């Protein structure tokens, strides 16, 4: 009900992988010019472009892309290089990838877009860039979690404000009928609850088991949120 990740977010190692992770642009060039395999995959399915993007080496990223590295390559769990750049708040890497036609709402095997990933990590900067590149702020991951549901679960206040400002649905429900305020209330995230209430969220909506956010917060023993919702309603 509260989960959107199946496992975690998440030999075969070649010299291109190592130089790309270390951001050594000249060596990557040399390895490429001598025939090295630009799309070699590790045991987990990582390409050199994954390694450069996960580590934030934007000029290695740019060089790899310019040389035809496949930006659609995904790991065993479905992470593309865009997902890994978002994981590390690597804005310029995200810029280069989107500039080379990377799909903004590419999904992993848990159905997460890069925006889901930035929300999960609380990366305000890449969140804003993805939203400006028409990332869908209501994209549905595993169990119907939108990026706003994720930011509310993880207590990402700046991210949630960004998503709300860009049209994330305050009333969207997961597959158990949890609204964002249900999620934030169950998790004891008092300031998130107040931001949703301030942005029009109904404290009275019920989940499929018939519980309000107040009922969920009390079930979870969240003293601060229980007091707040009692003050706001009673």
Numbering used by the authors: 883 to 892, 1265 to 1488
Paper text:
Ankyrins are a widely expressed scaffold protein family, which mainly function to link great varieties of functionally related but structurally diverse integral membrane proteins to the spectrin-based cytoskeletons. Each ankyrin contains an N-terminal membrane binding domain (MBD), which is composed of 24 ANK repeats and responsible for binding to diverse membrane targets. We identified three distinct autoinhibitory segments from the intrinsically disordered linker and CT regions of AnkB, and elucidated the inhibition mechanism of these segments by detailed biochemical and structural investigations.
First, we mapped the minimal regions of AI-b and the corresponding repeats from MBD responsible for the interaction. Using a similar approach combined with truncations of various repeats, we mapped the AI-b binding regions to R6-14 of MBD. We determined the crystal structure of AnkB repeats 8–14 fused to the C-terminus of AnkB_AI-b (aa 857–896) at 2.35 Å resolution. The AI-b peptide binds to the inner groove formed by repeats 10–13, covering a large portion of the target binding ‘site-3’ (repeats 11–14) and a small portion of ‘site-2’ (repeats 7–10) that were defined in our previous study. The electron densities of the MBD_R8-14 bound AI-b only allowed us to trace residues spanning Gly883-Glu892. The structure of the MBD_R8-14/AI-b complex reveals their binding details: Tyr886 forms a hydrogen bond with His374 and hydrophobic interactions with Phe399 and Ile404; Met884 inserts into a hydrophobic pocket formed by Lys407, Val437, Phe440 and Met441; and Arg888 forms a number of hydrogen bonds with the sidechain of Tyr365 and backbone of Leu363 as well as charge-charge interaction with Asp364. ITC results showed that single point substitution of Tyr886 from AI-b with Ala significantly decreased its binding to MBD, and Met884Ala, Tyr886Ala double mutations totally abolished the AI-b’s autoinhibition.
